Amino acid sequence: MSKEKILPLAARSKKAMLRQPKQVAYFSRDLNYKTHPDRSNLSYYYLPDGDIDNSIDLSVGSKHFLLGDSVELSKLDPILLALKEIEKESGAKTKDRIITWRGIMRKLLTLPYDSEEDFVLDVVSFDGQLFIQFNVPYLKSKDVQKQGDTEFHKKLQFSGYKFEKMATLPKPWPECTRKEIDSRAKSKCNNIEQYGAIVRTGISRIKILIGGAVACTADYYDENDPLSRYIELKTTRTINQYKDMIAFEKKLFRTWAQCFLLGIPKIIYGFRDDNCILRTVEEFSTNDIPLMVKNNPLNEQPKKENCYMSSINFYGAVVEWLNESVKDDQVWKLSYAKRNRQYLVLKEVTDENEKQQIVDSAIPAWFKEWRSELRNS
C-alpha cells in the first residue's frame, strides 16, 4: 500500500478566515463547449410581483429539455484558458496555489454536515500549481447511475432551470423589447449554455482560483466591483411544517457554502408546490444567512455550535492539508464515501499508465504547450 493520508472530520483550524474574493476573469460557454472571454451569456434579473401572482407554471416544456455531458461540463478548459490570457497579458506567473471549479470546493466544504454524496477527485501538481478535477471513472459511473434516476429528479432540475430562464433577461430592461419579455416561457432551456466567472480567493496562507457559473446580475455590469451586483437563483419546495423547516435549513447551508466562495451577496429562492407551480419568491443575503439561521424564533437553541464557523475552520484545515500534503510533479486521488463516515481518504498513484492517462484527460495539450513556451521564455 502507498502512504495513505487520513483527514479526520473533526479537524479544525481556529486561525482560518476567508480573504475578500476579487473577480479576475469571465467567460461564456456556448452549445459546442467553445469558451469565449466575453459577456455574451451574462443575463440580468427582472421579476415583478405580477409574475408571482399569476402562478407561473415551472414544468412546462420538460419534454424537450436538453442535457449536457458531465465530462465536458466538468473539464477545466475555461479556467485554464482564462489563465492563458491572464498569463499572456500579465507576463509573469501568478500567485495562486490551488486552481479548481466552484462545485469541488462547495462539496469539499459542505461534506462534514451534508454528506449524502460520495466523491473521488484527482489532484495534479504541475509547475507548483494544483489542478483538482472529478475522477473520470467516477464521472462515467455517475453518468451510468444517473441515467436510471426515474423522472422526478429531472423534473425538479428542469423546474429550477425554467425558473432561472423565466426570472432573467438576456439584455438590461431598458434595452429589451416586449417580444423578448413575453417569449421567455417559449424559449429553450439547457445547461450547456452558461456564463461563468473566475475569481481569486484566499484563506490562511493559500490562494485559490475558483471558477463558477453565475446565474445573472442585479441590473447592470459593475466594472468597479463586478461581484457586488451578482445574484444566484434556486428552487425549493414550499415550507409547511417543521420537517420542511429542517430540510430548507440544510439546503440553505449547502447553497450558502456554494455561494459564499464566489462572494455573491444576494440570493433568490422560488418556492413551488408539488405541482411545479411557482408559489412564492423571496430574497436572502449571504452575510445575513448565519445570523437569521441561528436566531430562529421557532427553534432558538437546537445547537450551541454554529455550523458555518466550523465549516470555515474545516475548509481552512483541508486546504492547508492539501497545501502541505502534496509535493511537486505528483498525482493524487482523494475520496469520501459511505463506508468512512469519520474521515476523508487520500492516496498516491504510482502506475505510470494511469498517471499519464489522468494527466492527459485532466490537462489539455494547448495548455501544456503554452506553459512550456512560458517556461522557455
Write the layout of secondary structure elements.
Elements: E1 5-8, E2 22-29, E3 35-36, E4 44-45, H1 49-53, H2 70-74, H3 77-88, E5 98-101, H4 102-110, E6 119-126, E7 129-134, H5 136-146, H6 152-167, E8 168-169, H7 179-182, E9 194-203, E10 206-213, E11 216-217, E12 230-237, H8 242-260, E13 266-272, E14 278-285, H9 289-294, H10 307-323, E15 331-336, E16 343-348, H11 352-362, H12 365-376
Parallel strand pairs: 5-7, 5-10, 12-13
Antiparallel strand pairs: 1-16, 2-3, 2-9, 4-8, 6-7, 6-15, 9-10, 11-12, 13-14, 15-16
Word description of this protein:
The chain has 377 residues and is α+β, with helices and mostly antiparallel strands. Helix content is 34%, strand content 24%. The protein contains twelve helices and 16 strands. The strands form three sheets. A ten-stranded mixed sheet has the order 1-16-15-6-7-5-10-9-2-3, with helices on both faces. Strands 11-12-13-14 form a four-stranded mixed sheet. Strands 4-8 form a two-stranded antiparallel ribbon.
How far is it from the N-terminal to the C-terminal residue, by CA? 41 Å
Helicity, as a percent range: 25-40%
Rg is 21 Å
- In N-to-C order, the SSE pattern is EEEEHHHEHEEHHEHEEEEHEEHHEEHH
Structural class: alpha+beta
Q: Largest sheet, if any?
A: 10 strands, mixed
Strand order of the largest sheet: 1-16-15-6-7-5-10-9-2-3
* Envelope shape: globular
- The portion of residues forming beta strands comes to 15-25%
Tally of strands: 16
Number of helices: 12
Relevant terms:
part of a larger assembly; 1 chains; 377 residues; alpha+beta; 10-stranded mixed beta sheet; 16 strands; globular; RNA-binding; nuclease activity; EC 3.6.1.-; Decapping nuclease
